[model samples]
Target: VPPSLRLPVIEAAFPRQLHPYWPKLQETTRTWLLEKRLMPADKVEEYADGLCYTDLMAGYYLGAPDEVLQAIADYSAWFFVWDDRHDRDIVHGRAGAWRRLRGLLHTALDSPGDHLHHEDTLVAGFADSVRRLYAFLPATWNARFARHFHTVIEAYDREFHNRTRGIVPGVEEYLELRRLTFAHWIWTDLLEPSSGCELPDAVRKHPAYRRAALLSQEFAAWYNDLCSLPKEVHNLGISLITHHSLTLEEAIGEVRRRVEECITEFLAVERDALRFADELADGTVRGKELSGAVRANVGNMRNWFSSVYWFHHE
Candidate 1:
């Protein structure tokens, strides 16, 4: 599809709302608790209900058009489907539960993110890479990814969960079920060009390695993994252009640099400022961490501080 056609869809999806379903989650929580036989109905109504519901955490809300909101909800539900079906088993428990959960998610109540897809092209391979990466991330990295992942999703969920949490809309669910449907097309384009080893100069400077941050993102992207990214952009309908049309190696290098640059830009208190003990101690740690997935995401971020050369933007 032309960028223009997709562009309007993304534009239409802008200004999306948050925690659209907060109040309903309370009711759902109460109902589920009672259904599970886990709580008395009175207590479930009073205590269990409030325990699970929350407002959307803060983030920019674009309040996009109806088509866009529909699009976002559809994609969001699919991601949860992927997470519920696959992630819970890998990280916490039963694998089959994930699979069964996947089915449920695909057929889930009030799903908002699903949309139809016409071909295999929508499954984009890049997300597979991301999934592989997410699979192997050590506890620290998992925590990092999950924390951030939950934050963003919760931001959107806070709005939607309240508005539509208990409602089951089958036709709408089917339409949104394929929400990550665009994954096939988007990530595959990024990976299509060549061999997996054309490292770029940009990666050499990525902060997770050059400075101190979570190394998981740097390592996975440097190696061309991290499945969530493709679908992360699915609802928006834009390919993560940075990874498009590059070799595995080239993609790795570009992604590595992009990860660092993005993190530095997004989280750092000062642009590219590195923290140091004695100079040798800091520089040595940075260099060692730069080459692998341990680049920064491997540990607790709050405990870390960086002292490195800052990236300059034109």
Candidate 2:
């Protein structure tokens, strides 16, 4: 797992430029309807501003050398694709909004590239994880459940990659890694024995990973809350899951509490990743710390952008 510590120049090349995207991620349709939902308007505006900055972190890396940027974009596309496919929810008849967001991001990613992160990487990863998880769970209500599910997910991966071909070249491998990471997250969130999946709580025991998880969660909450403010670009479509649950109004108070709980959980996960990464970075062992991995990756050459290495960025 310390291999996760191997820091690619991605972080150093692109610190937090991608932060702002989250806050400003409101849909036009949602905005028109929730105009008077009694939500905080000012807070939303603030988050929109912050997200505008934070989400663009990767863009900095994009501006780096062509080869590096291409590599990063490919990896990112896979990550986003896998995340979208697994997390995309349709409670009743809602369209795949998350996929749309991923699509948009993918487009932006490829605006300057010749390479494409093959979208199929996501489905392939999903298929693998599914093979593992599916065997452990009961079958879905239908007999063809596995077959149908596989076909659909695979199609989704294919369609997306095809559509985003211009933005990102074949980045199947990068996304496979992302899918694997998220598959674990999804499983943890759903059945990883809630005790261990309590995010920030889990990180507390591991100092190195804890810092990373905390920063990521705190930053996510701060940014989400900021964007959910009323009258902002975020009031439309679906608000971020982090901005309190939208399940019930009578349960508004309850929802807020739960949201706080989630935020706390999120912080734990972020810090855990960071702290673990930090430890690896500081270690002399082959796969101990994120920084060390980066050092190793570049053959011990001190890159110019060490300022944003996992340790330094946090």
Candidate 3:
């Protein structure tokens, strides 16, 4: 493995706290991964040690009871396995291969049967995790999750094609697609399931809500990029640094600047959403429910901010 890469220190701008379930969840996730044979025993600890799987879920699902948090940890572990496999050699195959695999995976998620055609245990494990997640979610929440999953898959394919074709995307274009590739949307969408309440569609799709999600995603991406710079700089020929012709220090500064901008935008949007929630919290039944849901939705995003920040720094 590459010697521990030292990059700039990016301070987390949000609250950082782990749930009480962290310790048990860590052990449970490790044992579960081993039992599932997701990886060889020798490799399991190394992989698990490097990942903040328990921390990531705990940060996002704070106050969640044991059962829900465990499910989140299971899904997260499965996600990393699937991600590693898919991203390993993405640029080598025909796009049709991925499409067919994606279709089978979707079927596995929507209707897991005895006979899914994939030979890969990693994909199978992801399907199994999705089933577990579906067991706890309503149809609407499942649909939202499916939508973000598909979006992320498509973005992954797009990036694969770009890499294969030796195409260096402009910064604007890169940012637009990188947002989807980060899969933060899918992660954020899970807040409803973890929290046990879906925000009403109108409030959920509000401009302020969308802005906050975007800013949070941008902040997290910039932070991740900064952290992974040293390793990625050596491996990826088309990263933000090379594309922008930046020195290592310059790239770090650029990402820091983007992170600050995103934090500023996120805070402003969050304030507006909170004010709107207060305005809606009148005495009527409809008003009360909507206001409460909106407030919960805001809290969900806040948890995400802390979650990603903790994942990066902790």
Candidate 4:
């Protein structure tokens, strides 16, 4: 951030929680990589430290059962490897091998059976994760998750295109694209599965819930962007500098300002959603569950913010 502007400290709206099966789940998460050949034997130990991302998974899905935690951890393992590859390998302007690869993976998610694509491990790992998810995630959840998953996949193609052309999106455009580029949408959809609270459509689609969900995703996206600027060579901050003719410090300030704004709005909408949850029933079981789901949804995003902030902020 700017010399005078500090990045917002994402507060934990709820108590900190971690999956009891942590670090130990680390073993299966890492071992799956070798089984899938996502990481070669020579690269395994070097990247063993990378599995450190698993600890965040523990906190992110603290309420998830042992099986669900492991399943999500498997995906966390794949996501880290996939992100590292994009951050390093594809930045070199490789052929759109990934474009074709994404198409296969998207199709694979559409129907995660045995017959998905080429002899590649990345997509294979993705397929496996979806298969695991299909086993437990409700049909509704699967559809929602798949839709957001595909959207993120498509968003990456645009990012690569912009980078190829040296394009700098305006602040609005950049943030919009930035939100989609990351998996924040994908993570929010996991609240039901992670929190063990399956909300019906009516509860999920209410204005308060939807409004809070939007703010939550935006905060997660911007907060993530701000803290990660130091390590990010080409990002919204850099784009802000070029698009608006700001100094690095000014760009940083702009990003931090947006992050703070996001959190304030998130808190407001979260309060609205909480009250709305209360209105769901009159001291009834349904009301209790709805509010719990709503509350956990807020904390779900909250923990993610703290984890990512600490993950890079530290």
Candidate 5:
């Protein structure tokens, strides 16, 4: 077990709020994926339960509408399966196959109407889920989501090259790539649909909001890395270990220290977010709506951390 895995590092920062529909979403997403054959029937439970993914999602996307949440969860399932395959499956080592699969997904997202790859599960599942997301949310999100998804694929290919070449990234390089590999921005971009509040362009552009967002991603990413230390053979710590000649225990300690630092910085940045939000609103209805969305987004980011902390204990 991780040193502080059972402790409420994130919970100390915010309350744990579960989506009311998680069980239904969990059950429904599992059944739906099975019915669609998106994953092997036997493996759905492993991914959904064993990995603690359903709850991971519920808290991150708390209060999303049932219909929309199902689509998000199902989309999440496909991404998880695809990511696992890339990380562990043998075929991902080949540049040719990687290029082909990446191209197929790109075509699916770029031109879903005309690009038909329904015979394959990953492409088909992603296409169906994305169609619903584009349908459920505005066109604005479509572009952002696609862009972030593309980044994820790009980072994964980069990761494969590094792993196969026996190249361990430096700490700074690992931090940037870790956030992408974790699909942090996609979760960030979905904040609007998940919260049902459109972050106005000004609010989204604000430096305070950007800092808070970055800190939140850092906090969650490092916290997750800390808890998964045992199973992860090659993680951020490997870079630290290589560079500093630290033992496993010492590197684990560094990861924990980094997570603590993230939260410390996060709290201050969140305070800035609130003050900036208030100044931007100046109490008008439209402005307040936009301002309130910033705080709520940060609030849910905290909820996501708490959910992960609690779920990690079991």
Candidate 6:
């Protein structure tokens, strides 16, 4: 067995809380995964005892209502299956995996009820999950999700190719691509559905908001890297050690530095973004247009922070 990697203590600076209905959500999602055959029978026992259900429901899906939380939990379960299956093929350099993944992603991104049903389990499963997820979201939010999902899927393909060629990207390139491959953007995009509020495009497109989003994504990725260092070292063969030529201990230090830097930026940008939203609301009558969204965005960020910390530790 590979040596166990030391777990890093990543204290979330924001409020840390979990959904009260987490237990039900976890059981519901687990049952759904098995019922749909998304999870193999052999893996059911392992996942039942694993952190996937607890992590998503108690962490990422925290604060969402029952319906939304269930949707998130089911979708998160689908993602775990999809990610594991694709990574297996990608790591082994299996031919045609990218083509199949491309089809699955495209099916997933297509509008609900717009495309013919897919027979392939991966594509069909993702399409059905996205359909269920979009039912809880507005069209605008759905569009935003599609955009982020497409980018992340494409980035997954790129990362697969890079792994097949044994290419360790430079830090800059790695960060840019990692943001997409990590699919934190998609998670952030879902903040609207989870919070029952959507930020206007004008505010979401603002520099401060964009910067804060990037920082949040970076925080998630770096934190995951720290937690998954041993797996990356022994299983996936990609990480700081491969990309930056650092010893395992040195790599841990680098990940810590990156995590710290991202969280600092996350805090600063979040503060400024909230202030900017207030300023915008002040000029408008009743703060009608932006106040709720701003509040939701702030809550979303806090959720992100808490989710990462909760998953990393508990």
TM-score of each: 0.22, 0.27, 0.83, 0.87, 0.91, 0.85
Question: Cα deviation in Å at residue 22, candidate 6?
Answer: 0.9
On lDDT, the candidate that comes out on top is 5
Candidate 5: C-alpha RMSD after superposition:
2.3
Rank order by TM-score, top first?
5, 4, 6, 3, 2, 1
Candidate 6 off by > 4 Å: 1-12, 52-54, 114-117, 230-244, 280-289
Candidate 6 vs. true structure, TM-score? 0.85
Clashes of 4: 0
Clashing pairs in 3: none
lDDT per residue (tens digit) for residues 105-164 in model 5 = 888887665543477777787888888777766677688788888888888878878887
CA lDDT, every prediction?
Answer: 0.30, 0.32, 0.69, 0.72, 0.76, 0.69
Q: Name the lDDT value of residue 151 in candidate 1.
A: 38
lDDT of 6: 0.69
Model 4 scores what on Cα lDDT? 0.72
Q: What is the lDDT of candidate 2?
A: 0.32
Going through the candidates in order, what is the number of backbone clashes in each? 61, 61, 0, 0, 0, 0
TM for candidate 3 is 0.83
Identify the superior model by TM-score, candidate 3 or candidate 6. Answer: 6
lDDT of 5 at 54: 74
lDDT of 3 at 128: 65
What does candidate 1's lDDT look like per residue over 137-156, in tens digits? 24443344334343333333
Task: Output the lDDT of residue 196, model 2.
Answer: 14
Q: How many residue pairs of model 2 clash at the backbone?
A: 61
- Superposed on all Cα atoms, model 2 deviates from the true structure by an RMSD in Å of 17.6
Give the least accurate 10-residue stretch of model 4, judged by summed lDDT.
1-10
